[PDB]
Amino acid sequence: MASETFEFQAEITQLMSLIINTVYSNKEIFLRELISNASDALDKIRYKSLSDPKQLETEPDLFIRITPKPEQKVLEIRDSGIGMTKAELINNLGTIAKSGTKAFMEALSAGADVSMIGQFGVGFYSLFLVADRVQVISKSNDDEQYIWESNAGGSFTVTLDEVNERIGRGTILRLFLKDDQLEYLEEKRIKEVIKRHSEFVAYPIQLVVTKEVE
Amino acid sequence: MASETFEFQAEITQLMSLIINTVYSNKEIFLRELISNASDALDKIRYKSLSDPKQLETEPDLFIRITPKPEQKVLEIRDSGIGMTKAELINNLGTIAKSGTKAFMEALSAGADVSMIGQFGVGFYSLFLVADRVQVISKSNDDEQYIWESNAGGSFTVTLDEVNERIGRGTILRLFLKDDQLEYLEEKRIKEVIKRHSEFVAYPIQLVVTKEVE
Numbered sequence A, B: 001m002a003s004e005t006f007e008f009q010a011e012i013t014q015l016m017s018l019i020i021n022t023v024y025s026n027k028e029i030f031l032r033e034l035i036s037n038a039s040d041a042l043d044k045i046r047y048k049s050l051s052d053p054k055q056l057e058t059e060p061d062l063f064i065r066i067t068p069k070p071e072q073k074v075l076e077i078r079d080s081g082i083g084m085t086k087a088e089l090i091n092n093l094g095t096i097a098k099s100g101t102k103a104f105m106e107a108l109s110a111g112a113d114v115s116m117i118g119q120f121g122v123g124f125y126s127l128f129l130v131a132d133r134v135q136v137i138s139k140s141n142d143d144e145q146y147i148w149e150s151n152a153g154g155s156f157t158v159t160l161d162e163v164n165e166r167i168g169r170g171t172i173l174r175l176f177l178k179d180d181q182l183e184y185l186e187e188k189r190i191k192e193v194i195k196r197h198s199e200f201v202a203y204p205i206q207l208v209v210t211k212e213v214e
């Protein structure tokens, strides 16, 4: 499958650099932001099923699932929410201006805790606090499975997915963690962050742990 | 991808029917057989890498990995062994007569424990003790990733894989468990069976467990 390349909207490119280069503390809130986004997407498929039930048939179970993949230095956060079409990935994750982007960059430069990022609608980008590369794999009932990929350059790619597991419906954030942020692969640390920041979630949060049989 | 359909060699169809219909006890040995096959495949890539270290670069870690997927009533057994090309899947898993097939069917009808199946070189088919459907997903350094699928009919399908996760190299047995054999989804049962039958394995056996964060 041939990939397509897109340029980030200018302020998003600026936001990404500010996040990667000027934020030193409270990185762990990336997980809160990603859990919140997942919860949001789960709400929308659930609501959209409030007046149409066939929607859930692609993935009847509603969940958030976190999967450390230590060998690849990867952390995946999956949900069975409403998902994103190809156009939605392109529009929502880079090409269109987010209204709060500038205000957030100003706030941050003024000394704001990065925890404030969600208040501005750009919490997705907090993932760059811990990862230097990300693939967003998404399946909406309304489209085929796609892969959005960024390395915090100035452009991203979108590719029809012929390489990852089928998700019936929903989104996977595949974070390629930085070498100094591998603590987020660890069961105990993941649990701690969830308990501190994601106490009130309406959906099961599953953690996938791989143990050697001795 | 369009599927290709192939007929099973006659005695294999017979073997499958006998396994599914006449074996009542010691079903758990299916796991020993599948673990042994995985170990075998891991031996072969390891040996072959002796004269071609680039062989491992597709998947540097040598492991066996067991993943229960309760939602789907599925149990996966994965290894990063040498894998099978498209022709190998077709030849090894259905079209070619296995020399011990007849002798095993006779032994079984004479009262032999099914545990003896490995002795006749047909241990793969023990999976039908617990599953009514199986997909074998395989990736050899020498070919593309393929899916072999059977429901113990008289025919199987082989399909170029554009729907599952990329394995770097190796084989996944995806067992669709029968409703009275779901005990093999449970961490405790799996550990028990490994401890009894697969005490001596040269490769780490990893078990992937999914737990809700409470």
Ligand SMILES: O=C1CCCC/C=C/CCNC(=O)c2c(O)cc(O)c(Cl)c2C1
Pocket (backbone or CB within 6 Å): A033, A034, A037, A038, A040, A041, A042, A044, A079, A081, A082, A083, A084, A092, A093, A124, A138, A170, A171, A173
């Ligand atoms: O928030 C996102 C940008 C669009 C904002 C509006 C939400 C749309 C509903 C579907 N949202 C999603 O797939 C989704 C998700 O499930 C988990 C996530 O970590 C992220 Cl980043 C997203 C995408």
Ligand SMILES: O=C1CCCC/C=C/CCNC(=O)c2c(O)cc(O)c(Cl)c2C1
Pocket (backbone or CB within 6 Å): B033, B034, B037, B038, B040, B041, B042, B044, B079, B081, B082, B083, B084, B092, B093, B124, B138, B170, B171, B173
């Ligand atoms: O044993 C198999 C039939 C061919 C016998 C000779 C083995 C060839 C080397 C590659 N073997 C495999 O991919 C393999 C595996 O990794 C795990 C398994 O459960 C099974 Cl059934 C197989 C295939």
